[PDB]
Amino acid sequence: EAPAAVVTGAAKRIGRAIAVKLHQTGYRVVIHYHNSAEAAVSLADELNKERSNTAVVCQADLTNSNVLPASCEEIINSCFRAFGRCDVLVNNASAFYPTPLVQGKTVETQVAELIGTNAIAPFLLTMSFAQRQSNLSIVNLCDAMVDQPCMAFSLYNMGKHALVGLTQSAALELAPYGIRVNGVAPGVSLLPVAMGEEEKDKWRRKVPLGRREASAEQIADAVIFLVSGSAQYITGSIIKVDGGLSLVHA
Amino acid sequence: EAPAAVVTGAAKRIGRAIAVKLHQTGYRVVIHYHNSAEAAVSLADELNKERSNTAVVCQADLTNSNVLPASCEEIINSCFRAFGRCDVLVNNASAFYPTPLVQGKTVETQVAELIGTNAIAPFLLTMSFAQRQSSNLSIVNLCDAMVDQPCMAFSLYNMGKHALVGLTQSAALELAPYGIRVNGVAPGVSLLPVAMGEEEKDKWRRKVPLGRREASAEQIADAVIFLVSGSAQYITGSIIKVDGGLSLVHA
Amino acid sequence: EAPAAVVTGAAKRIGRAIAVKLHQTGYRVVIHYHNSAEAAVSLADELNKERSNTAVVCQADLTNSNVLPASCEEIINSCFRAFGRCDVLVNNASAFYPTPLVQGKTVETQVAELIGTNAIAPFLLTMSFAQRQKSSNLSIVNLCDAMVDQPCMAFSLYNMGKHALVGLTQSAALELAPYGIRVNGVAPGVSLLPVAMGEEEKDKWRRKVPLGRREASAEQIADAVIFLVSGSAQYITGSIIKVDGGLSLVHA
Amino acid sequence: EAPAAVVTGAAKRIGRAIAVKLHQTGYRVVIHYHNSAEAAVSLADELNKERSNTAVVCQADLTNSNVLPASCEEIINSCFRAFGRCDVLVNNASAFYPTPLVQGKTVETQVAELIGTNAIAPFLLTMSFAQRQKSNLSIVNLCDAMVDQPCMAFSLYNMGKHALVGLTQSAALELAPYGIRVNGVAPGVSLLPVAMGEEEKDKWRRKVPLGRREASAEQIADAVIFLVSGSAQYITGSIIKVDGGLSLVHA
C-alpha cells in the first residue's frame, strides 16, 4: 500500500511544507507537534480531505529528559499504529535562540531544549525507527551555516554539529539494513516570526542567488529527492539548500 | 522551445548515462567526445531516432594547451548553433591515472591532461557558457567523493579534483547574479575503469556500506537530473555525494 | 606571577601528559579527576616536589545533570582560589564506549555521560572560564577527534559529542575573541590505546597509520596543546590541529 | 651540521619572515626569488653577516611551462650544492590577481601563473625534494584560510589554492613511508597587498574577530616553525589556520 512518514515539528513552516509534499508524493504522514495543536489538527484535516485516513497528529515535547526515549518510541509507534509501517523519518523539529557565554530559563533547561530537540531526539527517533524495522530513509534538517555560526548561539550550533555526526554515524551503521540517512541544510529560509522586517531584509541581502530566503517548499524539494528512488545510492550526504550564502566571506 | 545541454565526455559510461537521462527529461543534447567518435555517433543516432534533430556530436581534446580556450568556446558554440540556446553544462570528461611523486608521458603532459581535463577545461567551458548568456541555467561538475582520502600516488588527479571543488564554489558565487547555478556530483565507486582487474574491482565493491556494490552510471545521472531541475532552483555551490557511504568508512 | 591552567581528566594518559608539559612550561595546574584520586594526588605530589605550591587536585563528575553547571563553576573557582588567576582551560576528559542503534546502562545515562563529558561540560567550563575574566594570553584547548567524519561503527553518541565540541570550539572562538580569549582544538587519531586491548588488536590500528605505523604518544598530543597556548599562536583561534600521523587521509 | 631549508618567494613579506625565523632557529636557507633580486641579495647579506655561509639566493620563474620541472629541480639542487642537504621545503611563492569569468594577459598566461605558482611548482618541488633524499624532513605549503569563502572574481587563484590542499593531503599520504611530513599554514588576512589603499585595508581589518587587525608576517612564520619542529613530529596532512577567526565569520 502507500508508504508512511513521520515529520517532527510538522504543524508550521518548513516541517508543514515537508509533510504536504510527502503527502502529495503518495505518503501517509504522522504530523508531530509540541505546542501547535490547532495548526497540526488543521493540516491533518486538509490532508485527510484529500485522501481519507492518510494523516494523524502525534503530540510530544522533544526536550531532553529521562522520559525523552519513551516519547520518541511513542512517535514511531504512532506511525505503526495508524499505518502498519514507517518508511521515512524527517527530523525537522528544533529549538533556536541565543545562549550567550558571558552574562528566564536556567542553563540546564537551555541545554535540554537546544541539545535535546536538535540532536538527542533525532538520535532516539533514529534508534526507535531502526529497531522497529522498499526504500527506508531518514532525513535530518541540518544548518548550512554550522561552520560560520551566529554570535551567541553556541548551544544551538553544538546541537546542529551533533546532528551532522548522527547523520554520518547512523548512515554507516544502518546501511547494512538498507536504511539511508541524509541531511538537508538550509541557509536562510523562512525567517523567525519574532524577527523585525529590517533585520529580515538584512539577511535577505546576503544571499547571492536572488537576494531572498528559501521558500519552505524549496527546502521540502530536497527532502523529497533524498527519500525518492532517484537517491537510492545516497547515504551520509548533506545537501545545502542556501542560495550560496555559506560561500560568502565576512 | 526545448532546453539544451552540453555533456562533456558523453560517448560512454557516466557521461552517456547523463546525456540519455537529460534527453529523456526533454533536453536537446550536445554529445562531446575526444577519441570515441563511433560511440558518440551511435548515441546521437539512438537519441535522434527517439526525437529528430535533438542530439548533435562535438569533437574536442580537453588537454590544456594554447588552443584549449578556442576548443571550449567551440563546444559551447556548437550548442548555440544547433539549438539556439544552452541551458545546462555538465563537466564530466576526465583523465584518471597515477602520477607517483618518487620515480611514457612527460610530467608536463600529465599536468596538461589531469589538470587540463579535470579543472582548466571546466573553467574555460564555464567562462564561455556564462559569456554567451524564465530560464533555469546551471552547471554541474563531476567531482570525487574521495578527494580527502585520496588513492595512493594520484597527486595530480587529486589536485585537479580539488581545483574543480574550488571552481564549483567560486563560479557559484560569481554567477549567482546572472541566475546561473553551479553545483557538483561526487561519485565514490561507480563504473570501475575498464583496465582494472576483476579482483581489484571486487575489493572496492566490498568497502561500500550501502550494498557492497558500485553505483550504476544511472544513479550518478539521477543526482545530475535533480540539480538541473526546478526542484533545485535555490541550490548553488553544493556538491552532492553519491557514494553509498564509502567516504564515511575509516581505514 | 606564573600563569595557571585547569586540565580536565588529568590523572592519567593524555591529560596527565598535558598537565606535566604545562607545568614544565611554568604553569601552576589544577588536576581535575573523577574516579582516579590516587593517580591525581600522585601527580600533584610529583609536581609540587618540583616547585612547591604549583599543583592542586579537584574532583568532579562531568556527566550531564542538574548539578553539572555548579560542578563546572567550582572547577574554575578552584583555580582562582589556589592561584588567583585562570589563564588556560584544557577540555580533555572524555567518556568513550559504543552505543549501538540496533539490538547495563540506560540510554539516558549513555547520553548524559557521552554528551556531558565530551560536549556539555566543556561548554559549561567555557562559560565559567569566560565569566571569571569579563601581558595576558588566555586560551581554551578542546581535545577533539581526527576521525569525527570517518567514525567507528556503533559509536554514534561519542561521535555526536565530539562533533558538538567542534561546534563549541568555533562558536566560542567567535564570541570570546572580543575578550582576547582564543579557543582551539587538538584532534588525535590513534594515541594511547585502551589498557587491556590485546597487542594483536593494537597492531591492527597501528598498521593503519602512514607516519611510522604507530600511535601518537601522549607527549606528542601535549606538544600541540603547548603550541596553541603559547605566544607563538597568538593570532590562532577557531583552529583544530590534527595530530594523527595521516590516519584521517587513509581510505577504506 | 645545521639543517637546510628552501623558502620560495623569500625576498619579501611572509616568505622573508619565514626564512629569517628558520635562520634564527639555526637553519641554513635558500632564498628563492623571481623578480626581487635586490631584496633577495640584501636579505642573504644580512643573514650571512649574522652567521657566514648560511644563506644563498636562487632565481626562478615558477610560472608553469615545459621547463618548470627543470627549474624546480634546480631550486632543490641549489640547496644540496650550497649546504649538502635539504631538510625543509616551504612553498610560499604565489601569484594573486582576479580572473573574472564574465568580461593584458591571455587566459592561458593567467592559468600558467596562478595554477603554476600556487599548485604545479609546489608539486614539482615536492617531487624533486623527495627524490633527492638519501633528521626531521618536512614540507610546509602556504595555503589560504578563506578557500571555501572565496573573493569574488578570483576563480583561478582559488582553484590553485584548492589544488594545493589536495597536494598537501596526497603528498602527506605518499611520503609518510619516507619520513617526510607534509603540512600547511593557512593565513586569513596577513600583510595586505602593497597596491591596496589604507581605507580598503581597514575594511579587511575590521572583519577579523581576534583584534580587528591582520596577522603579522612573524605570526604566520611562527606556525611554519612549529610544523617543521620536533614538537610536530607526528603531524602530517594538517593545515593550521592562522586567521584570527576570520573564516568563522558569516556574511
Ligand SMILES: NC(=O)c1ccc[n+]([C@@H]2O[C@H](COP(=O)([O-])OP(=O)(O)OC[C@H]3O[C@@H](n4cnc5c(N)ncnc54)[C@H](OP(=O)(O)O)[C@@H]3O)[C@@H](O)[C@H]2O)c1
Ligand atoms: N528557517 C530557517 O531559515 C532555517 C535555517 C537553517 C536551518 N533550519 C532548520 O530547518 C528546520 C525547520 O526550520 P523552521 O524554521 O521551520 O523551524 P521552527 O519553525 O523554528 O521550528 C519547527 C518546530 O519545532 C518544534 N519544536 C521546537 N521546540 C520543540 C520541543 N521542545 N519539542 C518538540 N518540538 C519542538 C516546534 O513545534 P510546535 O510549533 O508544535 O511547538 C516548531 O514549530 C529546523 O531544524 C531548523 O533548525 C531552518
Ligand SMILES: NC(=O)c1ccc[n+]([C@@H]2O[C@H](COP(=O)([O-])OP(=O)(O)OC[C@H]3O[C@@H](n4cnc5c(N)ncnc54)[C@H](OP(=O)(O)O)[C@@H]3O)[C@@H](O)[C@H]2O)c1
Ligand atoms: N567511474 C567512477 O567510479 C568515478 C568515481 C569518482 C569520480 N568519477 C568522476 O565522474 C566522471 C565520469 O566518470 P567515468 O568513469 O564515466 O569517466 P571516464 O570513463 O574515465 O572518462 C569519461 C570521458 O572523458 C573523456 N576524456 C578523457 N580524457 C580526455 C581529453 N584529454 N579530452 C577530452 N575528453 C577526454 C573520454 O572521452 P573519449 O572516450 O571521447 O576520448 C572519456 O570517455 C569523471 O569526472 C570522473 O572523475 C567517476
Ligand SMILES: NC(=O)c1ccc[n+]([C@@H]2O[C@H](COP(=O)([O-])OP(=O)(O)OC[C@H]3O[C@@H](n4cnc5c(N)ncnc54)[C@H](OP(=O)(O)O)[C@@H]3O)[C@@H](O)[C@H]2O)c1
Ligand atoms: N587516546 C586516543 O587515542 C584518542 C584518540 C582520539 C581522541 N582522543 C581524545 O583525547 C582526550 C584524551 O584521551 P585519553 O585516551 O587520555 O582519555 P581517556 O583515558 O579515555 O579519558 C580521560 C579521563 O576522562 C575522565 N572521565 C571519563 N568519564 C568522566 C566523567 N563522567 N566525569 C569526569 N571525568 C571523566 C577519566 O578520569 P578519571 O580517571 O579521573 O575517572 C579519564 O581518566 C579525550 O578527549 C579523547 O576523546 C584520544
Ligand SMILES: NC(=O)c1ccc[n+]([C@@H]2O[C@H](COP(=O)([O-])OP(=O)(O)OC[C@H]3O[C@@H](n4cnc5c(N)ncnc54)[C@H](OP(=O)(O)O)[C@@H]3O)[C@@H](O)[C@H]2O)c1
Ligand atoms: N598576505 C596575505 O594576507 C595572505 C592571505 C592568504 C594567503 N596568503 C598566502 O601566503 C603566502 C605568502 O603571502 P605574501 O603576501 O607574502 O605573498 P606575495 O607577497 O603576494 O608573493 C610572494 C612572492 O611570490 C613570488 N611570485 C609571484 N609570482 C611568481 C612567479 N611567477 N615565479 C616565482 N615567484 C613568484 C614573488 O617573488 P618576487 O617578488 O621575487 O618576484 C612574491 O614576492 C602566499 O602563498 C599567499 O597566497 C597570504
Ligand SMILES: Nc1nc2ccc(SCc3ccc(Cl)c(Cl)c3)cc2s1
Ligand atoms: N529552528 C530554527 N533554526 C534556524 C536557523 C537559522 C534561521 S535563519 C538565520 C537567523 C540568524 C540569526 C538570527 Cl538572530 C535569527 Cl532569529 C535567524 C532560522 C532558524 S529557525
Ligand SMILES: Nc1nc2ccc(SCc3ccc(Cl)c(Cl)c3)cc2s1
Ligand atoms: N575519470 C575517472 N575518475 C575516476 C575516479 C575514481 C574511479 S573508481 C576508484 C578507483 C580507485 C582506485 C583505482 Cl587504482 C582505480 Cl583504477 C579506481 C574511477 C574513475 S574514472
Ligand SMILES: Nc1nc2ccc(SCc3ccc(Cl)c(Cl)c3)cc2s1
Ligand atoms: N576518551 C577516548 N576517546 C578516544 C577516541 C579514540 C581512541 S583510539 C581508536 C579506537 C577506535 C575504536 C575502538 Cl573500539 C578503540 Cl578501543 C579505539 C581512544 C579514545 S579514548
Ligand SMILES: Nc1nc2ccc(SCc3ccc(Cl)c(Cl)c3)cc2s1
Ligand atoms: N599571494 C597572495 N595571496 C593572498 C591572498 C589574500 C590576501 S589579503 C586579502 C585580499 C582580499 C581581496 C583582495 Cl582584492 C586583495 Cl588585493 C587582498 C593577500 C594575498 S597575497
